[PDB]
């Protein structure tokens, strides 16, 4: 699990932090559409 | 509690006299200095 | 309003989203609260009146924040408060070194209750035995 902070435009490109590990910039997988992916809610992230 | 400090600083004043003695005047100055504080 | 949103639409009025209960002790305020929570057709959320008084500074405002956000997430919940004197009704300043943190909690409640995009389709129930040492901001209608 991770927390999202900021979303970019057109391309998703989400800024994210885990809890205390580090902060990253990531993408969403093909399993879920980019609609219920708004800022300020916890999202699960593949460990690899 | 101050009596212990009287004996240690009496030993201090005896040590400043460069003697193994602990004289009466050491105790007089001991009482005076400890009482002062 | 929670079961017939038809009369008020055609008559064009608004319901009083805040109602205060008061009287002598042991008269039925608790029974009226349980009776409201009986057939509510909705989500009911109870509040212990002294739960918000906490040791660290500013955390009671966080409870009020999370409480009203949980209220906004679902549709048409009902807030119940009991023993509102613990949350705070006085505004003392006579050498104001006494209670100030619980005044801050009351102020964050007082702000989240009304003004600048209000809450929506939620209702507030309050109950106390001494409704004379209360804040005049609380007794102002639009909240009570």
């Amino acid at each position: 699990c991770t927390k999202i902070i900021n979303a970019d435009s057109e391309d998703p490109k989400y800024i994210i932090n885990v809890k205390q590990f580090a902060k990253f910039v990531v993408d969403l997988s093909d399993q879920v559409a980019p609609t219920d992916i708004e800022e300020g809610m916890r999202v699960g992230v593949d460990r690899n | 509690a101050e009596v212990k400090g009287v004996c240690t600083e009496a030993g201090m004043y005896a040590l400043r006299e460069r003697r193994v003695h602990v004289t009466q005047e050491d105790f007089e100055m001991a009482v005076a200095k400890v009482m002062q504080k | 309003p929670l079961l017939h949103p038809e009369r008020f639409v055609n008559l064009g009025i608004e319901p009083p989203k805040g109602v205060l209960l008061f009287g002598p002790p042991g008269t039925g305020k608790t029974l009226c609260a349980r009776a409201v929570a009986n057939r509510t057709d909705a989500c009911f959320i109870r509040v212990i009146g002294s739960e918000l008084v906490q040791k660290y500074v500013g955390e009671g405002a966080r409870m009020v924040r999370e409480l009203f956000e949980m209220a906004r997430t679902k549709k048409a919940c009902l807030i119940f408060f009991d023993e509102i004197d613990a949350i705070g009704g006085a505004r003392f300043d006579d050498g104001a070194g006494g209670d100030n943190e619980v005044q801050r909690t009351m102020l964050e409640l007082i702000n989240q209750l009304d003004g600048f995009d209000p809450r929506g389709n939620i209702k507030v129930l309050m109950a106390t035995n001494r409704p004379d040492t209360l804040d005049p901001a609380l007794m102002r209608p639009g909240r009570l």
């Binding site: - | 240690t8 030993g11 201090m12 040590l15 | -």
Partner: protein, 278 residues
């Protein structure tokens, strides 16, 4: 591999260019405590057997205190210049970092550094940040503060009763401390640095006024007459302000009106009483 006995300490010694150039004779009117701190540091290096044949149990530490500005830091600054043994100075509130146990870890690094280097003098100014009696308030931060004291109190007991690592530390308020710090087996010797008197005011005034001009029309004992509760630092502020006043008039010679304006500038905020009470 085995390193040389001090490799990582993350704290260095007083080097050779860090001597703060304060002479012993620069200090005026402290001979009741200059002589006391001289015999409490370098004298028991040689004469250690005299304690055992009399029974004083020779001290390890000495704690200075007084009103803020009676000459506490300068005496420790003075003995840094005229020592032949090594000297180590540490900030009293530098082992408060935001990790788990780096506080007790670097405290152990100090006393390991002090033991193996030389019979050195460890000076830790302002221990009020750490040496509070207090209580175990469960907040998440006080337990590291208490265990720093527990690490400090454990390491001040059992060296060998022979190693000449002398400890010196100083506060301004020696009241909000744990009583075990003022207990035997630890820092025992007590010195107070009070406000000066008429004779010590003369000695401080003569030493400070020995480097600028002071044309002979300036009386010096007349400013000594008014008591005014004058600390050690107020004498230096009087001489600076009188000098700066003469600087402002493009003058290299200090006059009697310069000392009067300095006296009004430094100390005037005392006249606050009503007449009818007496």
């Amino acid at each position: 591999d085995v390193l040389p006995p001090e490799a990582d300490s993350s704290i260095m010694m007083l080097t050779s260019d860090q001597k703060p150039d304060v002479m012993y004779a620069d200090i005026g009117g402290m001979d009741i405590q200059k002589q006391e701190v001289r015999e409490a540091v370098e004298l028991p290096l040689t004469h250690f057997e005299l304690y055992k044949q009399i029974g004083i149990d020779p001290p390890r530490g000495v704690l200075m205190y007084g009103p803020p500005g009676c000459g506490k830091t300068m005496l420790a600054k003075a003995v840094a210049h005229h020592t032949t043994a090594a000297f180590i100075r540490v900030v009293g509130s530098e082992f408060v970092q935001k990790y788990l146990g780096e506080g007790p870890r670097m405290v152990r690094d100090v006393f390991r550094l002090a033991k193996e280097n030389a019979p050195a003098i460890i000076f830790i100014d302002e221990i009020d940040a750490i040496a509070t009696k207090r209580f175990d308030a469960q907040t998440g931060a006080d337990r590291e503060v208490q265990r720093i004291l527990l690490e400090l109190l454990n390491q001040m007991d059992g060296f060998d009763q022979n190693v000449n690592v002398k400890v010196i530390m100083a506060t301004n308020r020696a009241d909000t401390l744990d009583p075990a710090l003022l207990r035997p087996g630890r820092l025992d010797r007590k010195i107070e640095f009070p406000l000066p008197d008429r004779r010590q005011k003369r000695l401080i005034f003569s030493t400070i006024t020995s480097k600028m001009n002071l044309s002979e029309e300036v009386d010096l004992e007349d400013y000594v007459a008014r008591p005014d509760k004058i600390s050690g630092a107020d004498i230096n502020s009087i001489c600076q302000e009188s000098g700066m006043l003469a600087v402002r008039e493009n003058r290299y010679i200090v006059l009697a009106k310069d000392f009067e304006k300095a006296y009004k500038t430094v100390i005037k905020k005392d006249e606050q009483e009503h007449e009818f009470y007496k």
